[PDB]
Design a binder for this molecule. Structure first.
Ligand code: HEM
Ligand code: HEM
Ligand SMILES: [Zn+2]
Ligand SMILES: [Zn+2]
Ligand SMILES: [Zn+2]
Ligand SMILES: [Zn+2]
Length: 270
């Protein structure tokens, strides 16, 4: 008979999104800084710190019955205090792979004792990813795409291979132009990178684009105005959790990218 009441502290924005997508959001009592979806619900919840800089006291003072996160959660010394306090904790992998959404969904569903709801969500996410990949197969002339991580004019980084964004670009039928500059993971933007990449599409984050003054500011960054992207103002700005979370909205984000890439394939050059 007896029913306990679950008090979940979720350590990562993408895990939080998945708890809410499974229908269990009312049991979440604490979230990290990156947990911006669904924004109306997560803005109301106590903050336990950023996912990689978690407060042990911020988590434990919420008296959780369960703490759940994935490999981005840290530091290790905070996880260790959770264990030493005797609070149930589980952590899952989060590889840069189109299999990560399904794996994280099954992980959360099992912890919450709803494996059937989890199979239903994973099957839908996989169907949405399938549909975007089918649209991406229409691209026979794939555009060169450069992802820029921006944090004002001071910080300008490009993402190469072994990143979630690299996986998203390729599955949406685009070419990650950071390979042409040799880039693995995150590396600084440079005159040399821009010459070698000459992207057709500039892919950025919402906040990043705001932090440089919008499209007008971005194209004041040396070299960018004169790329094929810069010339046609072909800038795609997406929310960070949406583009890079590898969560339930992965198929929706792939569809937005591939639609944009298809247009660039037709219109960027000559
Ligand atoms: C692609 C993955 C990443 C995303 C989505 C991301 C996102 C963010 C966001 C949303 C902020 C706060 C808003 C702002 O800066 O205006 C931020 C700040 C920051 N990011 Fe990142 N970032 C990423 C990767 C990195 C990496 C790899 C580093 C370090 C090597 C880094 C270092 C920082 C620092 C130092 C701040 C400023 C913290 C503060 O001022 O309080 N970021 N980032
Ligand atoms: C969905 C993807 C991501 C989102 C939404 C996100 C969000 C944010 C936010 C809001 C901050 C500011 C936190 C603060 O200043 O206290 C931040 C900082 C940071 N992020 Fe991320 N992040 C993401 C992925 C990543 C990745 C992939 C890395 C590294 C590979 C990374 C490493 C960092 C680092 C080093 C900071 C500076 C804060 C610290 O050192 O504790 N993040 N992120
Ligand atoms: Zn339980
Ligand atoms: Zn994650
Ligand atoms: Zn190339
Ligand atoms: Zn859409």
């Amino acid at each position: 008979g007896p029913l306990g009441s679950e008090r979940i502290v979720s350590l990562n924005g993408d895990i939080t999104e998945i708890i809410f997508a499974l229908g269990m959001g009312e049991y979440v009592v604490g979230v990290d800084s990156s947990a911006t979806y669904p924004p109306e619900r997560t803005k109301m919840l106590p903050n336990i710190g950023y996912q990689r800089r978690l407060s042990a006291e911020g988590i434990l003072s919420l008296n959780p019955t369960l703490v759940i996160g994935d490999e981005a959660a840290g530091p290790p010394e905070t996880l260790a205090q959770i264990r030493a306090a005797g609070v149930p904790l589980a952590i899952t992998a989060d590889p840069p792979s189109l299999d990560a959404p399904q794996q994280k969904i099954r992980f959360v569903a099992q912890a919450l004792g709803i494996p059937q709801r989890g199979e239903r969500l994973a099957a839908q996410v996989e169907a949405e990813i399938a549909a975007a990949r089918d649209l991406a197969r229409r691209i026979t002339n794939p555009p060169h795409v450069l992802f820029l991580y921006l944090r004002g004019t001071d910080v300008q980084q490009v993402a190469g291979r072994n990143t979630a964004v690299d996986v998203m670009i390729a599955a949406a039928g685009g070419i990650n132009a950071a390979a042409d500059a040799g880039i693995v993971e995150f590396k600084p933007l440079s005159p040399e990178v821009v010459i070698a990449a000459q992207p057709d599409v500039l892919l950025v984050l919402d906040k990043g684009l705001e932090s440089v003054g919008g499209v007008d500011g971005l194209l004041k960054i040396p070299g960018l105005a004169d790329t094929p992207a810069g010339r046609q103002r072909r800038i795609i700005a997406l929310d960070d959790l949406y583009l890079l979370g590898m969560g339930p909205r992965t198929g929706q984000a792939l569809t937005d990218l591939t639609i944009a890439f298809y247009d660039a394939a037709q219109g960027s050059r000559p």
